[PDB]
Amino acid sequence: PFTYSIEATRNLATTERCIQDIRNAPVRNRSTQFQLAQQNMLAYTFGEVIPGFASAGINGMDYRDVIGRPVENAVTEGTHFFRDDFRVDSNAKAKVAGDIFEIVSSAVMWNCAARWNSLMVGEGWRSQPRYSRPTLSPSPRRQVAVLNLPRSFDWVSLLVPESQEVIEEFRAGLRKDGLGLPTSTPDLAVVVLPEEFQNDEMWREEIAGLTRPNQILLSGAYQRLQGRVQPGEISLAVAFKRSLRSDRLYQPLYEANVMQLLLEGKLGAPKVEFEVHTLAPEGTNAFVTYEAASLYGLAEGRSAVHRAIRELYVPPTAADLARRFFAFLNERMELVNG
Amino acid sequence: PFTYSIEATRNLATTERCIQDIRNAPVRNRSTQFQLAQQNMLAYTFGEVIPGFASAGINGMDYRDVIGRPVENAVTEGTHFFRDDFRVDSNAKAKVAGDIFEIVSSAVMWNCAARWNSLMVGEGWRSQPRYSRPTLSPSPRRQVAVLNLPRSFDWVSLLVPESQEVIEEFRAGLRKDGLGLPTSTPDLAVVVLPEEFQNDEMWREEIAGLTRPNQILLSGAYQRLQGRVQPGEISLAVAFKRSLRSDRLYQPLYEANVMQLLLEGKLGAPKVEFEVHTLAPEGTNAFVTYEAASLYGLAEGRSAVHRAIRELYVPPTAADLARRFFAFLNERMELVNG
DNA sequence: GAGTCCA
DNA sequence: CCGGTGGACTC
DNA sequence: GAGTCCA
DNA sequence: CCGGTGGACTC
Ligand SMILES: [Mg+2]
Ligand SMILES: [Mg+2]
Ligand SMILES: [Mg+2]
Ligand SMILES: [Mg+2]
Ligand SMILES: [Mg+2]
Ligand SMILES: [Mg+2]
């Protein structure tokens, strides 16, 4: 569970355990002795807890201590089974804390979408835990999907095919001069739910925790929307970076620029909203780096130039994350006609 | 020396040793037990050798083994003196190997610069080791300075003050609207040598190795050119990356786009040549990523249309890096009147 | 299992 | 995916 | 010296 | 500054 439990750990089958001993099943060309079983770790620590939709104490706690609990639980497990032999490289803790920050934040946002969508189709406002009721007029057309995108992905594949064709034709032209314009991905996109899906229940159901089936339901969701999203209906992009270093700030900044050039410049979309979430900004003048104007915006020199990155948000608690997303939906969905 | 010598090591003062034991002198909030003494390492391994300008065997061995030699000499020193107590994090070896790849490459380019410059002023073509004599006609006005840029730096400080003035008025306008356009730095700039320095011998002396004094001379050179370079006199920008990961690609790509926007779009300079060098590209997607067109040029009625990054280069040997730079000088200096 | 690829 | 670094920078 | 920033 | 990583995909 969230608080480590000796008994609950004893109850695990060897394949569900957080530390996997691989001393006698080594990986070709790695010295790894113990693997941190990320998916096991989410199931044990967040099996019946989504932060922000759990107890008041978990919802209000320093979000860093929350995102850090899985690794801390896994090290206690490893120390119990293997004592002085237990060791893990800091680059395993780094990899796993990254994925954990992303998957858990994305799950908080998923439950916000479900509460939001439930209101929009006429079912009122679930009241535990307590959050401000949105004041925007409910409409099934204002529902949204939270898509944790896979490690490797190309966000263009979310678009209806006619929009993919406008992008393809643009690149065709660049190819004749030996140039390209590749697109990669944010960590997460929120999109307006396509009309064909506005009576499906799955988008309105809050999950109770990161059980292996809920992990898969959440991580596979993008496959359902691929091919179905209009350029204007990509409502928020999010990169997640557990901590910052000044040389790791650039991927979101570049991708945001490319998203703006293509969605706004080539497909008529309104302002693309892209933001970055971290738990440890400090040591960097990251807030200053992310004030940069869109390069596209500058190159066209239209009446209003916006930032490529709308904000660097540092969530202090899971409740805060949730409250911020609700306030964002409440404002951004005005723009979608009821 | 370049080949490890127990005897050379035995002769070193405690303060010159490649490994510095800090078990009794810990860094507050660090668990570090032994320090990799980067500057002592370069002095030991490269104190009498700049690769590409040394013996035929060093010039032509796999450059990855050339750049990995200091860390390998350090680990041999550590293992010898401390045996099984010798421990250092992979993150220590990552940091220092990145700085080795940068400093040694820069040094190879410094000697190239010096040999070019000797020819430019009419002193003929040094013959050992033998490189193809350049064909462009000599002129003191076609000498160049090789500038290994400091860790924290803003390339705009290289520019003559009237140019800095143009960038700053443009940014002042952007601030009214709550936007900025920050500049950082590539790792290295080659600039045209300013008129005032064009009969100074320091810019034509090849160094014999990376002794501490020569380390300082190379790392300090950018200071002598601050405030002196015309916008079209920044001839090449280099980003060094020892290995690649797909998330680490974006800092040079973004910066190259900012240099192009500001130098070509606001200051009238020709195409900004910016390239990346790695020893380990781990696949082919990196080459695809760097075929991206420069964003500013994609807006109708701006500067020319071309790649942000000209090329991802994987130097097989020191001699090859030397050769590529001489051939690049032979062509790009056509643009300068002699 | 072994190899490759991802970030 | 990101954290532990050697050296520079600040008082 | 003690502490922070740099990438 | 960058290397060691857990999981995904394929046979
Ligand atoms: Mg990602
Ligand atoms: Mg993702
Ligand atoms: Mg991320
Ligand atoms: Mg640098
Ligand atoms: Mg540099
Ligand atoms: Mg570099």
By C-alpha distance, which of B205, B206, B286, B215 is closest to B245?
Answer: B286
Taking residue B37's Cβ as centre, other Cβ atoms within 10 Å add up to 19
Question: Which nucleotides of strand D lie within 7 A of protein CB?
Answer: 1-9
Instruction: Report how far residue B290's alpha carbon sits from residue B58's, in angstroms, rounded to the nearest whole number.
Output: 31
Helical packing angle, A69-82 and A38-46, nearest 10° = 110
Phi, psi of A281 (to 5 degrees): -80, -30
Q: Are A229 and A191 in contact (CB under 8 A)?
A: yes
Q: Which amino acid is at B253?
A: L
CB contact under 8 A, A261 and B178: no
User: CA-based diameter of chain A, in Å?
Assistant: 65
The C-alpha atoms of residue B121 and residue B268 are separated, in whole angstroms, by: 29
- Greatest Cα-to-Cα distance within chain B, rounded to the nearest angstrom: 66
Q: Beta strand B311-313 with B274-277: parallel, antiparallel or unpaired?
A: parallel
**Do B291 and A180 lie within an 8 Å CB cutoff?**
yes
Give the rounded distance of the alpha carbon of A323 from its chain centre.
16
Nearest to A181 among B246, B292, B302 (CB): B292
Cβ(B156)–Cβ(B183) under 8 Å?
yes
A-chain CB neighbours of B180 within 8 Å are 288, 291-293
- Dihedral, CA of residue A168, residue A169, residue A173 and residue A176, to nearest 10: 60
Let me know how long chain B is.
Answer: 338
Backbone angles phi, psi at B91, to 5 degrees: -70, -25
B28 touches strand E (CB under 7 A): yes
- C-alpha A140/C-alpha A147 separation (Å) is 19
What technique was this entry resolved by?
A: X-ray
**Type and span of the H or E element at B191:** strand B188-192
Q: Quick check: helix, strand or coil at residue B31?
A: coil
Distance in angstroms between the alpha carbons of the first and the last residue of chain B: 42
φ/ψ of B103, rounded to 5, equals -75, -45
Say yes or no for a CB contact (<8 Å) between B293 and A174.
yes
Residues in the annotated binding site of A for Mn(2+): 102, 148-149, 187, 240
> Is B293–A180 a contact, with Cβ atoms under 8 angstroms apart?
yes
Q: Which residue ranges of B make up the annotated binding site?
A: 89, 102, 148-149, 152, 187, 240
Chain A residues close to B250, C-beta within 8 Å: 250-251, 253-255
Which residues precede chain breaks (C–N over 2.5 Å) in chain A? none
| SS3 call for B203 | helix
Map tokens 């949105």 to a residue.
Answer: A134
Cα separation, B301 vs B25, in Å, equals 61
Listing DSSP states for B61-127 in one string gives SBHHHHHTHHHHHHHHHHHHHHGGG----HHHHHHHHHHHHHHHHHHHHHHHHHHHHHHHTT-----
Query: Angle between the A90-120 and A69-82 helix axes, to the nearest 10 degrees?
Result: 140
Contacts of B4 (CB under 8 A, 6+ apart): B72, B73, B76, B77
Residue A80: count other Cβ atoms within 10 Å of its Cβ.
14
Cα-to-centroid distance, A102 and ligand 3 (Å): 7
Q: How many CB atoms lie within 10 A of CB A279?
A: 21
Whether the CB of A152 is less than 7 Å away from nucleic strand C comes out as yes
Buried b (16+ CB within 10 A) or exposed e, A43-59: bbbbbebbbbbbeeebb
In chain A, what is the straight-line distance between the N-terminal and C-terminal CA atoms, in Å?
A: 42
User: A-contacting residues of B 230-259, CB under 8 Å?
Assistant: 246-251, 253-254, 257-258
Residue type, A319: A
Listed in sequence order, the residues at least 6 apart from B322 whose beta carbon sits closer than 8 Å to its beta carbon are B52, B53, B108, B111, B112, B131
d(CA A188, CA A244): 18
Q: CA A73 to CA A16: how far, in whole Å?
A: 14
- What is the C-alpha to C-alpha distance for residues B291 and B264, in angstroms, rounded to an integer? 19
As a whole number of angstroms, the distance between CA B215 and CA B279 comes to 22
Q: Which residue ranges make up each domain of chain A?
A: 1-338
Contacts A–B by Cβ distance under 8 A = 96
- DSSP summary character for residue B312: E
- Considering only alpha carbons, which residue of chain B is nearest residue A184? B289
Q: What is the DSSP letter of B173?
A: H
Strand partners, B180: A292
CATH class as words, domain B1-338: alpha beta
Q: Which residues of B touch A186 (CB under 8 A)?
A: none
Both tokens of residue A91? 């680059």
Report CA Rg, chain B.
Answer: 21
**Could you give the CA distance from residue A114 to residue A146 in angstroms, rounded to a whole number?**
9
SS (H, E, C) chain A: CCCCCHHHHHCCCHHHCCEEECCCCCCCCCCCCEEECHHHHHHHHHCCCCCCCCCHHHHCCCHHHHHCHHHHHHHHHHHHHHHHHCCCCHHHHHHHHHHHHHHHHHHHHHHHHHHHHHHHCCCCCCCCCCCCCCCCCCCHHHCEEEEECCCCCCHHHHECHHHHHHHHHHHHHHHCCCCECCCCCCCEEEEECCHHHCCCHHHHCCCCCCCHHHHHHHHCCHHHHCCCECHHHEEEEEEEEEECCHHHCHHHHHHHHHHHHHHHHHCCCCCCCEEEEEEECCCCCHHHHCCEECHHHHHHCCCCCCECCCEEECCCCHHHHHHHHHHHHHHHHHHCCC
Q: Is the peptide bond before B129 cis (omega within 30 degrees of 0)?
A: yes
Helix (H) or strand (E) holding B239, with range, is strand B234-240
Q: A299 — contact with chain B (CB < 8 Å)? A: yes
CA distance B20 to B18: 7
Residue entry with tokens 């249309």: B305
**CA–CA separation, B282 vs B247, rounded Å?**
12
For the CA of B272 and the C1' of D5, the distance in angstroms is 33
CA dist., res. B205 & res. A6, Å (int): 69
Residues A129-148 as b or e (16 or more Cβ within 10 Å = b): bebeebebebeeebbbbbbb
Strand F closer than 7 Å to the CB of B2?
no
Alpha carbon distance A263, A296 (integer Å): 11
**Quick check: B18 and B74 in contact, CB under 8 A?**
yes
- Residue B224: helix, strand or coil by DSSP? helix
Q: Do B292 and A182 touch (CB under 8 A)?
A: yes
Give chain E positions with protein CB within 7 A. 2-7
**Residue B146 and residue B187 in contact, taking contact as beta carbons nearer than 8 Å:** no
Q: Residue type at B195?
A: E
Positions 270-289 of A with beta carbon below 7 A from strand E are: 282-285
Out of A254, A300, A305, the one facing B179 most closely (by C-beta) is: A305
Tokens of A34: 């113990």
Give, as one character, the DSSP assignment of residue B263: I
Residue B39, exposed/middle/buried by CB under 10 A (0-12, 13-18, 19+)? middle
Identify all chain A residues contacting B293, using CB atoms and an 8 Å cutoff: 174, 179-181
CA nearest to B78, candidates B18, B162, B29, B139:
B18
Instruction: Measure the CA–CA gap between A311 and B5, rounded to whole angstroms.
Output: 54
∠ Cα B65 B71 B73 (to 5°): 90
Contact B262, B165 (CB under 8 A): no
